[PDB]
Each structure stands twice: as structure tokens, then as C-alpha cells.
Design a protein around this nucleic acid. Structure first.
Ligand SMILES: [Mg+2]
Ligand SMILES: [Mg+2]
Ligand SMILES: [Mg+2]
Ligand SMILES: [Mg+2]
Ligand SMILES: [Mg+2]
Ligand SMILES: [Mg+2]
Ligand SMILES: [Mg+2]
Ligand SMILES: [Mg+2]
Ligand SMILES: [Mg+2]
Length: 153
RNA sequence: CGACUCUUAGCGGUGGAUCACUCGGCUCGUGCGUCGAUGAAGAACGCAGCUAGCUGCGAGAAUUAAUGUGAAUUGCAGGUUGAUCAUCGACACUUCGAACGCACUUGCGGCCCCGGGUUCCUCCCGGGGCUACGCCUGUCUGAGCGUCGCU
């Protein structure tokens, strides 16, 4: 599958991919920007802390009306949330990348998430009912998620 | 440095433009110029080993016979003295519908002939053929203090 970014060392790099994932794209982008510079153990621990509301995802671009928490000050930001479903989906995908690395025989504890990006999947359609006999869209915003690990010691 | 924002490029998404195709339309021209009470057009309901739609067909129901052709149909199974296709002149063609026994509930009949029932004794059941309107010619039966003739 044609990836967006090629790895600098494909022997020591593994890939994972997911398409048409029923997650909010904006929450997925902000948490992937949080994951993007991390080692795999730190990323797994921080994604568990997001679901347990111990560490937050800073909302940097899509932050309109997003409330302010105390835990965002570790990121140099004021607005943060804890997207649970979005943290679990790219934890399942991170486990898939773990399983793909173990298949290639790469070292488990040296994996650093080198590339990750979130794209917009095709939007799927439902319908809501408004006043004065008007019917409005109830569109979902699913996402494609892409990541590449790299042995970085 | 970092976040955020702007511009450009690479790659990836969203979207289906452009191009190239076309068993489709539009227009012109030619030949023929054919429906129906022997039941038309239209509609309804059914019919396939696995079948919803489209198509084809009518209880003989994706067809029967005959003729031409000549080894297939096919998504999967099953089984040359002619498989399949095409032609189509034979046979068949459920219900409503001008729609025809009366009505349109799928209801109520009447007449005749058969088979069970019975042993012609009417019942009951099943089957078949008739039972609409208008109108032409002829037949039969009639009507009139209509016009007459005769006993
Ligand atoms: Mg903003
Ligand atoms: Mg506001
Ligand atoms: Mg409402
Ligand atoms: Mg209303
Ligand atoms: Mg770009
Ligand atoms: Mg059928
Ligand atoms: Mg035949
Ligand atoms: Mg033949
Ligand atoms: Mg009634």
C-alpha cells in the first residue's frame, strides 16, 4: 500500500494502517500529534493515562469551545481533553504495529513512532429532524490512520 | 527553537472534473402499412432444481410440436434414432378487461347432458355445454272496437 512518507530505513522500520475507522477526525488528529514524538512504551502508558484521565491530549488546532484543564500545562497549552475512543483505536493500531515488528524480528523496546498521520475518510450519512418540518444532515466524520515505527537508539 | 497561522513544493486522503472509449439517443430517407366477441389494447395473478428484478411464458406456464441447423447450456449441480439456437405454418393460451347469466362481495343463480350419490327419487358433490345488449334476413308463437271476406 502506497504510504505517504517513506521510512529512512525500511529494514528497521514497520508499518500499520487503518481505513474507515469510526472515530472523530479532530480528536484523532490531536491525539496523534500528542503520540507523534513518543517511544512505544511511553505512548502506550500515556494512552492508558488518557483513558484513565491521568494525562490529557492538548487541543491545539481544533480547540473551539474546548474547556481548560490543569493537565494541559505540561504541554505548554491551556485546552485539553481526554478522547477515550480515539485513544483506544490507535492503541489497537499500536498493538498491531507491535505485532508487525515482532514478525519482522525488530527489537521491541527500541521502537520510536517516527511517522503518524490522520486523513479524512468518506463521510457517512444520517438524518436529524428539526423545527417547522425541516430535515438536516447528521454526518459522521471517520478517519484513516497511518503510522510507521523505527528502531531509534 | 516550540505551539498556532500564511505561502510553495513532495507524498497521502476527500471529490469525480478532464480525456479516451459507446450493444444509446437525435435527425433524414426507403419499403411495407397488419388490431378486436374465432375475445383486442391494457391490467392482475402465477410459472425456473437452486430465482428477488428485468425478460420470456400461461396450469402443456424462462415453454410443447414441426422445420432448418448441427454438439452444446453453463453461476453451480443433475442427466447424432439429434443437445442448443433460430424460424415458426401445428397445438395450447389462468383472471379482470368492448367483457357477455345477475352482481363485482370473488357473492347468488337458471336450463340441459354425464360421473359418484342414487340404483329415475328428489336431494348432495364433481365435470362439461348454454344463459349480455343492439341490429339484418328468415322461422315459430301471438296481439289489435286496423282494413276486410266468408259461414
Ligand atoms: Mg484554532
Ligand atoms: Mg466561541
Ligand atoms: Mg429536533
Ligand atoms: Mg411535520
Ligand atoms: Mg501539502
Ligand atoms: Mg417466480
Ligand atoms: Mg421441439
Ligand atoms: Mg430439430
Ligand atoms: Mg357488498
Amino acid at each position: 500500500v502506497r504510504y505517504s512518507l517513506d521510512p529512512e530505513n525500511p529494514t528497521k522500520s514497520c508499518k500499520s494502517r487503518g481505513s474507515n475507522l469510526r472515530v472523530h477526525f479532530k480528536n484523532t488528529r490531536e491525539t496523534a500529534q500528542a503520540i507523534k514524538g513518543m517511544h512505544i512504551r511511553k505512548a502506550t502508558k500515556y494512552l492508558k493515562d488518557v483513558t484513565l484521565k491521568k494525562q490529557c491530549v492538548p487541543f491545539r488546532r481544533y480547540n473551539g469551545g474546548v474547556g481548560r484543564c490543569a493537565q494541559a500545562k505540561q504541554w505548554g497549552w491551556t485546552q485539553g481533553r481526554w478522547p477515550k475512543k480515539s485513544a483506544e483505536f490507535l492503541l489497537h493500531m499500536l498493538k498491531n504495529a507491535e505485532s508487525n515488528a515482532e514478525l519482522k524480528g525488530l527489537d521491541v523496546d527500541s521502537l520510536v513512532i517516527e511517522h503518524i498521520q490522520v486523513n479524512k475518510a468518506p463521510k457517512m450519512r444520517r438524518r436529524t429532524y428539526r423545527a417547522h418540518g425541516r430535515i438536516n444532515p447528521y454526518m459522521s466524520s471517520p478517519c484513516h490512520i497511518e503510522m510507521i515505527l523505527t528502531e531509534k537508539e
